[PDB]
Amino acid sequence: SRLAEAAHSSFARHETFAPRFGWLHKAYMQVQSNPEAFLADDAPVQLGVGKNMVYAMRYWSRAFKLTREHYGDDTNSRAMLSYPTWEARWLLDEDGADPYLEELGSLWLLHWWLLSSRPGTKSWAPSWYVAFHLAPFSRFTLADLTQVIVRHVNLSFPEGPVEASIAKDVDCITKMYVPAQRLRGEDLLSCPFRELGLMEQVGGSSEWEFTSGSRPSLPARIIAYACLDYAARTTRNAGSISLARLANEPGAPGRAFRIREADIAAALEKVAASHQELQLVEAVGQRSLTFTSGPFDLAWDVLDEQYDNVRSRPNFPTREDWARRYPKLAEAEKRELKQL
Amino acid sequence: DSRLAEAAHSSFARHETFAPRFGWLHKAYMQVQSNPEAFLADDAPVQLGVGKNMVYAMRYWSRAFKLTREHYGDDTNSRAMLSYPTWEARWLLDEDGADPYLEELGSLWLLHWWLLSSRPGTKSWAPSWYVAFHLAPFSRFTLADLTQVIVRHVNLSFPEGPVEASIAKDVDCITKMYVPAQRLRGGEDLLSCPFRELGLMEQVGQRGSSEWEFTSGSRPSLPARIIAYACLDYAARTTRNAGSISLARLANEPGAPGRAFRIREADIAAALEKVAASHQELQLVEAVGQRSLTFTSGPFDLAWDVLDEQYDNVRSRPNFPTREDWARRYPKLAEAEKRELKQL
Numbered sequence: 001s002r003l004a005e006a007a008h009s010s011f012a013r014h015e016t017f018a019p020r021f022g023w024l025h026k027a028y029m030q031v032q033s034n035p036e037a038f039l040a041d042d043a044p045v046q047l048g049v050g051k052n053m054v055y056a057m058r059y060w061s062r063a064f065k066l067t068r069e070h071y072g073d074d075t076n077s078r079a080m081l082s083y084p085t086w087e088a089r090w091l092l093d094e095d096g097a098d099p100y101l102e103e104l105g106s107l108w109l110l111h112w113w114l115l116s117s118r119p120g121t122k123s124w125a126p127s128w129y130v131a132f133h134l135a136p137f138s139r140f141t142l143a144d145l146t147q148v149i150v151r152h153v154n155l156s157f158p159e160g161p162v163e164a165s166i167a168k169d170v171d172c173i174t175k176m177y178v179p180a181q182r183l184r185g186e187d188l189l190s191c192p193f194r195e196l197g198l199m200e201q202v203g204g205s206s207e208w209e210f211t212s213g214s215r216p217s218l219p220a221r222i223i224a225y226a227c228l229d230y231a232a233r234t235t236r237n238a239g240s241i242s243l244a245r246l247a248n249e250p251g252a253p254g255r256a257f258r259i260r261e262a263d264i265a266a267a268l269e270k271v272a273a274s275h276q277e278l279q280l281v282e283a284v285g286q287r288s289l290t291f292t293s294g295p296f297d298l299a300w301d302v303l304d305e306q307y308d309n310v311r312s313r314p315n316f317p318t319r320e321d322w323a324r325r326y327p328k329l330a331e332a333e334k335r336e337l338k339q340l
Numbered sequence: 341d342s343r344l345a346e347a348a349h350s351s352f353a354r355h356e357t358f359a360p361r362f363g364w365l366h367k368a369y370m371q372v373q374s375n376p377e378a379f380l381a382d383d384a385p386v387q388l389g390v391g392k393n394m395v396y397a398m399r400y401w402s403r404a405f406k407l408t409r410e411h412y413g414d415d416t417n418s419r420a421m422l423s424y425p426t427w428e429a430r431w432l433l434d435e436d437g438a439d440p441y442l443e444e445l446g447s448l449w450l451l452h453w454w455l456l457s458s459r460p461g462t463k464s465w466a467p468s469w470y471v472a473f474h475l476a477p478f479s480r481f482t483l484a485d486l487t488q489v490i491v492r493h494v495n496l497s498f499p500e501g502p503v504e505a506s507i508a509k510d511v512d513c514i515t516k517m518y519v520p521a522q523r524l525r526g527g528e529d530l531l532s533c534p535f536r537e538l539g540l541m542e543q544v545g546q547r548g549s550s551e552w553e554f555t556s557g558s559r560p561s562l563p564a565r566i567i568a569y570a571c572l573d574y575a576a577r578t579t580r581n582a583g584s585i586s587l588a589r590l591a592n593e594p595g596a597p598g599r600a601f602r603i604r605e606a607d608i609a610a611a612l613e614k615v616a617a618s619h620q621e622l623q624l625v626e627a628v629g630q631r632s633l634t635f636t637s638g639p640f641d642l643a644w645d646v647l648d649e650q651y652d653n654v655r656s657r658p659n660f661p662t663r664e665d666w667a668r669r670y671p672k673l674a675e676a677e678k679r680e681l682k683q684l
Contacts, residue, residue, distance in 0.1 A: 180561045183561075
């Protein structure tokens with residue numbers, strides 16, 4: 001049951017809103033000192049948005065792995081408070097990697113986090129997971145893709161599908177990834193994920209399709225990071241992962257970024273040239289990415305290099321500093337791990 | 341032919357091929373609000389959070405989008421051109437303003453209009469853009485073709501001006517600003533540019549074979565009130581009083597919204613009809629028997645009523661400054677306008 005393994009049962013919690021940059025920015029800025037930022041009586045005024053948008057803002061930060069949620073202490077009746085993740089501190093802080101999402105690679109990174117699943121940290125976007133990793137066809141009507149998601153939810157989640165919520169997810173997917181000109185042609189909002197060029201309307205009319213050209217906006221280091229991060233799901237030590245798996249396995253970068261094996265190989269070779277610990281090797285006649293120590297730390301060496309080594313900046317907190325500052329992050333991870 | 345000189349200052353390639361970035365507009369605003377030396381300070385790179393080779397481009401983009409004006413400080417021993425935030429930047433970009441995070445596509449249409457904008461005392465900083473949108477005789481071109489058209493205009497308009505290499509860098513920047521990122525080649529690499537969402541420019545039958553075009557479909561992301569504001573703002577360039585301007589001029593005249601937004605006369609008419617229904621001061625009238633937009637009072641103030649309405653009347657918010665309040669806080673803005681007016 002691939003979907004249940006990969007994702008939480010979360011549908012239409014974006015309240016029909018696609019991501020906005022100002023939402024990601026303002027959520028981080030507020031949640032850092034205030035775990036009650038989204039629950040507060042005057043959250044709408046404090047965050048500068050309407051009531052349903054507070055909800056959508058809270059959801060998007062959880063979905064992009066920028067916050068985790070956990071029970072409050074008892075003064076707080078165990079309300080679901082939000083805490084920023086170390087990754088949010090790394091990416092979005094004013095002294096971080098890319099606080100204004102100036103580089104297209106940072107949007108590819110957020111897209112990877114949205115789809116990402118690991119033991120203890122499942123995806124909050126099962127409809128996105130299905131669309132990219134599990135769906136049978138690259139071209140579909142919105143009703144076709146709604147139906148495909150409904151069918152997986154039937155198989156994966158006991159409470160089962162709420163069709164109207166899944167159809168809302170499919171609307172939201174299209175608003176997130178397709179150019180604005182194709183959206184029912186004030187009213188229209190920006191969405192920076194359209195820059196990824198992942199989805200197009202078929203000349204809706206009434207079909208949509210995921211694209212398949214080359215991806216010049218996707219940096220080699222982002223691909224290499226995602227490959228090592230994927231290998232890290234299952235291994236903590238030196239080892240290897242086949243290019244075939246990286247290209248084709250549901251959940252991996254080939255299907256997440258919609259890129260072919262040859263493109264993954266090209267990126268890995270480019271990056272391995274800069275990292276002694278990384279190689280692309282042949283063993284008749286299949287290529288593999290090799291790493292001489294645990295792939296998660298190496299993924300982060302590669303990723304941090306892309307952004308000129310944010311971790312070495314004055315007063316940048318380590319993952320362990322951050323865990324002591326926000327102990328409920330590990331408690332939330334542990335709560336998920338208990339379910340498995 | 342001196343249209344380009346009349347419209348624009350002689351400024352080429354000062355962005356060094358960096359297309360606009362949201363982070364640059366935002367952080368420039370936040371810094372210049374209190375520090376006129378924000379782009380000149382020794383610590384500017386750290387303070388602005390940009391690379392040393394990005395400081396000037398960031399400064400340029402704020403001036404070009406009409407978000408700052410520059411003028412000498414009161415300094416007695418300085419030729420240094422200091423920067424001051426415009427009232428428009430306070431209205432648009434402030435945390436308390438119309439759209440600080442550019443969440444609405446209308447706000448990028450607006451910025452595009454401001455980049456192209458020229459009136460007495462406030463000419464455009466982007467001559468290459470002005471030629472590309474308003475003076476070029478073609479909509480489909482190779483980059484070489486566009487470069488040659490700009491060169492022709494620069495020869496006619498600026499006896500002194502730029503080398504060809506600078507104009508080619510403007511053409512490169514115009515492409516990165518407006519075409520989908522997928523058409524671009526990094527040599528990291530590609531930056532986001534929110535103006536790509538306007539869908540104004542596209543690659544055509546690639547190979548190889550080098551070609552691009554300004555697009556000509558309908559524009560669902562371009563709000564009617566942004567169209568109407570632009571029409572009235574355009575009219576305001578030449579009149580301060582009740583008057584009119586024909587739909588044909590709005591659609592076709594170099595500088596006007598038809599060429600700036602690449603929309604048809606019918607589209608402009610439909611937007612003005614929607615906006616005129618709400619505004620008793622505005623009408624569409626047939627005279628011979630061509631249609632005109634009429635206004636019973638000065639079009640600049642009406643343009644701003646229509647534009648502020650589009651953003652839920654920011655000017656009504658508690659403690660929002662009038663232009664006069666802002667002028668008293670930044671007297672160098674009017675000083676800069678006066679200097680330019682003195683040249684005409």
